[PDB]
Amino acid sequence: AHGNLSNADLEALLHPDGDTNIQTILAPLLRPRVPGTPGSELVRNYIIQFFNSALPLWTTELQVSSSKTPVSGSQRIPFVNIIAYRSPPGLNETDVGWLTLVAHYDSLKDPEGFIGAIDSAAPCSIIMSAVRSIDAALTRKWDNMEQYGIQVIFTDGEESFGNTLTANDGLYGSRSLAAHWAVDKYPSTAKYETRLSSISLLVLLDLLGAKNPQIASYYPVTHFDYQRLAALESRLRELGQLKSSGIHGKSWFVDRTTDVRSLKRQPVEDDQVPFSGLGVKVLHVIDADPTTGEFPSVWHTPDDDENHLDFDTIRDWSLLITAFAAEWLGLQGFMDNHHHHHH
């Protein structure tokens, strides 16, 4: 489901805490975080603690598996997906449809020390920042009260390990989660049948934080959601709320005028593929040239670091995803973050 945001709603998107900004949320992610390593545990527990302190009404959960990789020999490498969710009160969680926002928090193993600032530390911080901004509005609109909640998934083991293309290499966390949630059966009485079927919309963020991204629409079934996202971007650009673009900047959403039945782009293999293959509606927000399909220039090089991040672009992304989630959840009229007893 979804609502419609007034221009006023769009001018009240930022969260009231100016001291906790995206650079602040991003910084502890910008470290090597290969699966199974100490850096993975440090980043994972940073994310969990962020939700536990700043978003205490959310429930956090981990989904754990292990798998051999092309470089692990006989040893199983563990993959730990991080799930956080918040549902409306006095609703059976098994009756809730979830807007589900996703990014991978693991980092590539080769070269040693690889940071992956756009891949996907910055996507992770965009999600974290955005759900922080909408949590206050969700509390307001649920205090006034429909059967939809909000969910984030930070996936482990997205990145492949082997030198050569191998079908079961990569997407370790997303394959395990989809596979497990597809067999997590609800009661017969519940509105939804499985934990997987309760995903109303899966939005996967990947390779964001570079300047001038190009975002194609890859799934007809979510092209309308794509067009809603592009509209919010356009409106924000007009109202001048975008820092990385002037009022006449080019739109990132190259397929925005394309007809759903005219969409002819090959999907990019990534974490949405296991979910999409089992029938989940997925929207894949990934920066990639729409024609060739080639990723940003820093992709999988040492230059994918903090110094090459565009923080104005990252702030625009956070605002855009906040606006998209607020529209989808129908938070129109509940975005005011002015503080009472303060002039």
Spell out the long-range contacts of 111-114 with Cβ–Cβ below 8 A and sequence spacing 24 or more.
111/302, 112/32, 113/32, 113/302, 114/32, 114/300, 114/302, 114/304
Q: Choose which of 119, 255, 271, 316 interacts with Zn ion (CB under 5 A).
A: 119
In which residue are the tokens 């530390």 written? 121
Helix (H) / strand (E) element for 187: namely none
To the nearest whole angstrom, how small is the minimum distance from the Cβ of residue 86 to its own copies? 24
Within residues 141-170, the interface with its own copies by CB under 8 A covers 165-168
Active-site residue flag, 270: no
Of Zn ion, its own copies, none, which one sits near residue 119, judging by CB under 5 to 8 A according to partner kind? Zn ion
Taking CB under 5 A as the rule, does residue 270 contact Zn ion?
Answer: no
Q: Which stretch binds Zn ion (CB under 5 A): 50-58, 86-94, 114-122, 123-131?
A: 114-122
Active-site residue flag, 193: no
x-or-dash string of contact with its own copies, 177-206, rule CB under 8 A:
-xxx-xx-------------x---------
Taking CB under 8 A as the rule, does residue 264 contact its own copies?
Answer: yes
Instruction: Look at residues 254, 156, 152, 277 and name the one whose alpha carbon lies nearest to residue 203.
Output: 152
CA dihedral 228, 230, 235, 238 (to 10 degrees): -170
Within residues 74-133, the interface with its own copies by CB under 8 A covers none
**Which residues, at least 6 apart from 91, have a Cβ–Cβ distance to it below 8 Å?**
147, 149
Q: Which stretch binds its own copies (CB under 8 A): 20-28, 92-100, 261-269, 307-315?
A: 261-269
- Structure tokens that stand for 173 in this block: 């966390």
Q: Is residue 283 a contact partner of residue 203, using CB atoms and an 8 Å limit?
A: yes
Q: Is residue 332 a contact partner of residue 3, using CB atoms and an 8 Å limit?
A: yes
Taking CB under 8 A as the rule, does residue 175 contact its own copies?
Answer: yes
Query: Under the rule (CB under 8 A), what is the footprint of its own copies?
Result: 165-168, 171, 175, 178-180, 182-183, 197, 220-221, 264-267, 273-281, 293
Which residues are catalytic, by number? 158, 206
Which residues are near Zn ion by CB under 5 A?
119
